[PDB]
RNA sequence: CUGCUGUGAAUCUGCCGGGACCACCCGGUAAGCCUGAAUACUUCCCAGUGACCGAUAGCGGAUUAGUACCGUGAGGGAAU
RNA sequence: UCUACCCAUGGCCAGGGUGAAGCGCGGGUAAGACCGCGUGGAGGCCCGAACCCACUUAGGUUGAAGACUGAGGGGAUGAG
RNA sequence: GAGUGAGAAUGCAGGCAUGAGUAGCGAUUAGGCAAGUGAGAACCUUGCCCGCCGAAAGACCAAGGGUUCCUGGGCCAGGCCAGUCCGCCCAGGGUGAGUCGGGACCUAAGGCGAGGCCGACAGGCGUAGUCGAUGGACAACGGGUUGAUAUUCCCGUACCCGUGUAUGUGCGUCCAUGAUGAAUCAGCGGUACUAACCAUCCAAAACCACCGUGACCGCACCUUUCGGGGUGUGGCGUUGGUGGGGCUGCAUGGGACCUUCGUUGGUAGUAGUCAAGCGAUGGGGUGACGCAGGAAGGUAGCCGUACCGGUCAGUGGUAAUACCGGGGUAAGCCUGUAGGGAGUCAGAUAGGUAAAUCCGUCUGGCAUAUAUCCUGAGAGGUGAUGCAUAGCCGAGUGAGGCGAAUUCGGUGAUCCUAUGCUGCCGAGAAAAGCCUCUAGCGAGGACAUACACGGCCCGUACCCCAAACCAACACAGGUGGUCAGGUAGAGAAUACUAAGGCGUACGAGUGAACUAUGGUUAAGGAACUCGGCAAAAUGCCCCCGUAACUUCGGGAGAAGGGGGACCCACAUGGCGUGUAAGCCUUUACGGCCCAAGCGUGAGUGGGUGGCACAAACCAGUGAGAAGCGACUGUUUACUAAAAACACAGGUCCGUGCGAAGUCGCAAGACGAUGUAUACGGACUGACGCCUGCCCGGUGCUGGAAGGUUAAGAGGACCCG
RNA sequence: AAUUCCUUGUCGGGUAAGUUCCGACCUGCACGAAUGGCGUAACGACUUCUCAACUGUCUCAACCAUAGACUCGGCGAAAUUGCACUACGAGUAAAGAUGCUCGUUACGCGCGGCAGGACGAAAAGACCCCGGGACCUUCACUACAACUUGGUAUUGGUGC
RNA sequence: UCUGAUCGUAUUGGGCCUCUAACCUCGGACCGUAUAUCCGGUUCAGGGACAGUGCCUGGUGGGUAGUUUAACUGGGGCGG
């Protein structure tokens, strides 16, 4: 949940931290972890393609299974629920009966010791993973694939879920987290439930340092820079830029979705803004 | 005459040239290939010549010279 | 090889204070809220060396120095 | 025929004046004397004093340098003066490793990159690879020696890899020993072709009743004069629909013949299969990890002391009572304590890119013990009849020789247990290595002792917070790591000092002005000045006492005020420590208590002295109000540190996933090993209260009715 | 008012006396709501004003010590430089004279001091102008990358 | 044959619907391969004559680039 600090110092004052209430264990599986390093927002040319990234507290990658297909009718019990740097949600550590350990994105209402079965025959209880064709229309699902066997892609993040609106032919129509309605192939798997840590968003970081640890460097505002740097720059005084707002690279505001994309044939409407 | 993109022919009353283009004359025979000599040049060696220099000149360099020395480096660069 | 940011891997940070959550004991109640006292040892917390800066001032100003020196000054478990 | 004429280009090269025998001669330590050498001495050698550093200006290294090191010479250049001296010049010498730092071991970021993809060409990325320590793994310590090296040589004692022989154990295949095992035929039940059996579903062909009537027939009524035409009914035909009854097929479920599979009689525990040791390039464990924080248990060091050796320091007092100097010794091998860590046997199972007795998971049983096992500080033993040492001898640069005691306490680490434990959230490298598991090799091979051997390449001198490196200089600057004595003190601050090291390269004088850097000051006390700039002041410990306002934490060390030296008494006390004794035992590296001994405050009472008792050094100025920025941060290296930038928070716009966005001609990359509670962009900037009106202008978003509009189609007309 | 030209606006407070400061007034030259508006505890080597304490900052200076300066010994530079046995006054002149005129004053040579002049030294004025650059802006001109429109090639079949 | 209305057989463009065989897939699974998230191949599942890429063409285009931006003037600007 949210544990709020007492203002014992000006930094800590508004701030809050996640009460980690769902954490059974502090120490990830030595098998399922890969090493990882920060790129600091620089590509293979070493240039900065993505500004504002860097700093950061060194972190190791847990290998999540988004791919779950293999195990069928093999029931797993949830061993621990532990904490993952790389993503917003938690991760459940499953033990199959096969004696194979896997991580999954921890669903909502998943408690330690539960049973979870993936396959066709499975129940519509939380945590279970089944192809969209076997799911009663109108449920709430998450970690959804795109193509049949393309891994889980939609609705991974904390507190978030997809409503499955219906079924026609080989297309099942989903309402995305964004509020946008998109069609998809009924062969592709989904997981049943919402996603844990729905309080994630009310964490109030409270001091610059904290955001630094988490990896974000500071951001300089356009209007401040010289006109050589940024299009908004310049002026003697404070300015509003005196120009219609743009990126630092001069491209204006507006729709950036490139038209003609293939998937565009699937999409029923895009999200609506400020309605 | 020639590049790329399209369209796309005829085999000798054929086809291409004769400064848009058309006729008549003349010339030639595309879309296959080789080919010496006459012409250009001197890192390098031999033999010379000079109304060229003669040591602040002549090569940056007659003396340890691309050395000493300067510069992270590309590079610069003496004096006797 | 200076400097700006990043990445990997190491090291450093005398000494002193303050006393967060949590936990415990007693109170308080129907059970709470809540109130003492204990542990406990949080923090871009406080005082202050190493260290990192460079605020004021005096001197230097063909300098000891192509940017220093002396007095004081700021940060000093952290965006170090 | 001219490279033909110079006074001037802040002209170029060289030589030389003027300033001028002038400024300087490089800190914040400081030198003096006697003798010595020598042509010559403020500066060189020795001696005796004095002074300075002492978390350094001492000791040892990395980087960098490259002979600067040692001996013997030198003394025109160099050294800011001289010079016999030198870090300068000349000659010779000097660097010794199985273990220390690296390679032959391992990988991180990153580099390169066979094929490869992309790119007119040049090339851009990148897979397998292979490199790349600042990290991981891996075996040594004390003492002595030379003019110069030493964890390298030597002495003593270890450890780690390999190789050969010899000996003894115990195993092996051959022989055989255990364990098991499945295969076929033969006696049987439910899977299950196939004809049915049972139950139900449905309706072609449809039997019947009713209504609706393509059209036809027309009886009756209305209608225009009559027609057209509308209505009521029936005869039927069925573009038709509805309710009841049966046959046929169909599907499904249930038992059953075929078939098979499972079960058990014969064999065939016979022909099979495995088992000594090696064992992966394969599987699994481990390796393997943040930051903070103590508490605890230890030692190193230091301070005492039993004991040992010694001195009389021409002064008033002091012969042992006083004083000075000793009061040492490693790795390793034993031993396994404080601390910390751990459930274990049997069955099944294929999940672990084949197989696994291993690992995982599921079952079970058996365990709450100080049981067991691993780990591990230090105590103790050995190492050590040795080595070292305070001194004492004579010889004298020096050589060498002898060599006493070598107990018990206190204090105490930032070091060790500890890569531990406990919290916390920001969730904290890899690979080799070592341990195992089989695949696989295998007739031979393991284990111990003894003996004999092999142990490679590079660094190794000297400087290293500096006159030896970077700074053009023998330059007040810069440069990472390791050691850390004493008395005061909270302390690695400061003061004084040990060990050790220096006095550092111009001097000698002299009361000038003036300048700098320190010092003191009657009376007044900001009158100074742009401005209390600069000084002065405050300053420590322990008590007392503290306001407005407040986001309830702060403000606050607010302000303001008191005590502090020495001596005695309380006190043969209080607290810490802990020995003898005592008590207790599961008798051990035990526990409990502890007279003595050593250490140390705090306080109360009484004295004593001074101008002053935080006596030096060290060490907050405080209070009221306003603007700006919430805050810690950051910034114009070399005139600007702020009110600027950042910030946590806010709102908007974009982005549905090799996304948007950026880097690239592309491939590809980052975004992100993320997925709308996420990511990019823009403005605002903690918190509180709030955020009004305008869509004409110009942007963005959406929309096509028109109006305008390219190439492509179209070739009427016209011309040759 | 970090915004108010007129302006030291007007009043109150503080001072013996206040162009600054604090509090109001509103006649806002030319405030105003995320280029945010109005507040705000804590914080500031920020700016501004007042007070206590304390003082050589001052009335008004004095004395002392070191390091320079000064003397002697040794070494031994620099920037600068058309010349030279290089006065002053009133004038004159490219309009500010050591150097010209008329006068007045002054023995030769040093040494220590001070800074009025030498339009002193330094740096081919940074201000201003003119010419030339550069870099920045944009509904200046013209282009190009990027982004996009339709045609055509790669590109085919059956249907309406 | 003409003022004109039509069918069916041709030609030829326009829209629309589908299909699969070009083409596309950072979808799967095997193989090259002992080791490869590279790359290539086979196959499966999808898209599908669209998209992408050429050539032609119209836009948008301070994102970048080259440049221009007068003179007189009782200094220059403003004015004229
Ligand atoms: Mg590169
Ligand atoms: Mg960003
Ligand atoms: Mg998380
Ligand atoms: Mg947030
Ligand atoms: Mg905050
Ligand atoms: Mg910003
Ligand atoms: Mg700016
Ligand atoms: Mg720039
Ligand atoms: Mg711009
Ligand atoms: Mg600006
Ligand atoms: Mg402005
Ligand atoms: Mg704005
Ligand atoms: Mg602007
Ligand atoms: Mg949004
Ligand atoms: Mg040819
Ligand atoms: Mg020459
Ligand atoms: Mg000559
Ligand atoms: Mg060089
Ligand atoms: Mg406490
Ligand atoms: Mg408490
Ligand atoms: Mg702090
Ligand atoms: Mg502070
Ligand atoms: Mg200073
Ligand atoms: Mg001076
Ligand atoms: Mg200082
Ligand atoms: Mg300080
Ligand atoms: Mg201070
Ligand atoms: Mg401090
Ligand atoms: Mg000439
Ligand atoms: Mg001449
Ligand atoms: Mg000349
Ligand atoms: Mg000259
Ligand atoms: Mg001279
Ligand atoms: Mg002079
Ligand atoms: Mg003189
Ligand atoms: Mg002098
Ligand atoms: Mg000196
Ligand atoms: Mg000096
Ligand atoms: Mg003498
Ligand atoms: Mg000391
Ligand atoms: Mg070194
Ligand atoms: Mg000598
Ligand atoms: Mg000499
Ligand atoms: Mg000399
Ligand atoms: Mg020497
Ligand atoms: Mg030599
Ligand atoms: Mg490469
Ligand atoms: Mg190649
Ligand atoms: Mg290597
Ligand atoms: Mg290393
Ligand atoms: Mg030595
Ligand atoms: Mg040694
Ligand atoms: Mg790990
Ligand atoms: Mg831990
Ligand atoms: Mg201790
Ligand atoms: Mg006597
Ligand atoms: Mg003694
Ligand atoms: Mg097991
Ligand atoms: Mg021992
Ligand atoms: Mg620790
Ligand atoms: Mg050997
Ligand atoms: Mg060397
Ligand atoms: Mg050595
Ligand atoms: Mg050495
Ligand atoms: Mg030293
Ligand atoms: Mg220099
Ligand atoms: Mg040097
Ligand atoms: Mg020196
Ligand atoms: Mg130096
Ligand atoms: Mg340092
Ligand atoms: Mg000390
Ligand atoms: Mg000190
Ligand atoms: Mg001293
Ligand atoms: Mg000494
Ligand atoms: Mg004098
Ligand atoms: Mg004097
Ligand atoms: Mg003075
Ligand atoms: Mg006075
Ligand atoms: Mg007085
Ligand atoms: Mg006053
Ligand atoms: Mg005044
Ligand atoms: Mg005055
Ligand atoms: Mg004033
Ligand atoms: Mg001051
Ligand atoms: Mg003072
Ligand atoms: Mg208090
Ligand atoms: Mg006080
Ligand atoms: Mg206060
Ligand atoms: Mg005892
Ligand atoms: Mg007894
Ligand atoms: Mg007992
Ligand atoms: Mg008295
Ligand atoms: Mg203080
Ligand atoms: Mg106000
Ligand atoms: Mg600030
Ligand atoms: Mg604010
Ligand atoms: Mg800075
Ligand atoms: Mg500056
Ligand atoms: Mg500051
Ligand atoms: Mg400054
Ligand atoms: Mg800034
Ligand atoms: Mg806010
Ligand atoms: Mg923000
Ligand atoms: Mg934000
Ligand atoms: Mg993109
Ligand atoms: Mg906006
Ligand atoms: Mg702002
Ligand atoms: Mg509008
Ligand atoms: Mg509009
Ligand atoms: Mg409009
Ligand atoms: Mg509106
Ligand atoms: Mg539009
Ligand atoms: Mg046309
Ligand atoms: Mg004001
Ligand atoms: Mg006024
Ligand atoms: Mg007034
Ligand atoms: Mg006043
Ligand atoms: Mg006011
Ligand atoms: Mg205004
Ligand atoms: Mg508004
Ligand atoms: Mg606005
Ligand atoms: Mg603001
Ligand atoms: Mg305000
Ligand atoms: Mg305020
Ligand atoms: Mg600050
Ligand atoms: Mg400040
Ligand atoms: Mg003097
Ligand atoms: Mg002299
Ligand atoms: Mg000169
Ligand atoms: Mg005149
Ligand atoms: Mg005159
Ligand atoms: Mg005259
Ligand atoms: Mg004359
Ligand atoms: Mg004179
Ligand atoms: Mg003068
Ligand atoms: Mg002067
Ligand atoms: Mg002057
Ligand atoms: Mg000029
Ligand atoms: Mg100009
Ligand atoms: Mg196409
Ligand atoms: Mg196209
Ligand atoms: Mg543009
Ligand atoms: Mg431009
Ligand atoms: Mg041009
Ligand atoms: Mg003009
Ligand atoms: Mg004018
Ligand atoms: Mg004029």
UniProtKB/Swiss-Prot annotation:
Tree of life domain: Bacteria
Subunit structure: Part of the 50S ribosomal subunit. Forms a bridge to the 30S subunit in the 70S ribosome.
Biased composition (Basic and acidic residues): 252-267
Official protein name in the record: Large ribosomal subunit protein uL2
GO term, biological process aspect, one: cytoplasmic translation
Keywords for this protein: Ribonucleoprotein, Ribosomal protein, RNA-binding, rRNA-binding
Gene designation: rplB
InterPro entries per record: NA-bd_OB-fold (IPR012340), Rib_uL2_dom2 (IPR014722), Ribosomal_uL2 (IPR002171), Ribosomal_uL2_bac/org-type (IPR005880), Ribosomal_uL2_C (IPR022669), Ribosomal_uL2_CS (IPR022671), Ribosomal_uL2_dom3 (IPR014726), Ribosomal_uL2_RNA-bd_dom (IPR022666)
Region (Disordered): 1-19, 24-57, 222-275
One Pfam family of this chain: Ribosomal_L2_C
Similarity annotation: Belongs to the universal ribosomal protein uL2 family.
Role description: One of the primary rRNA binding proteins. Required for association of the 30S and 50S subunits to form the 70S ribosome, for tRNA binding and peptide bond formation. It has been suggested to have peptidyltransferase activity; this is somewhat controversial. Makes several contacts with the 16S rRNA in the 70S ribosome.
Annotated Basic residues bias: 36-57, 268-275
SMART domains: Ribosomal_L2, Ribosomal_L2_C
Entry's Gene Ontology cellular component terms: large ribosomal subunit
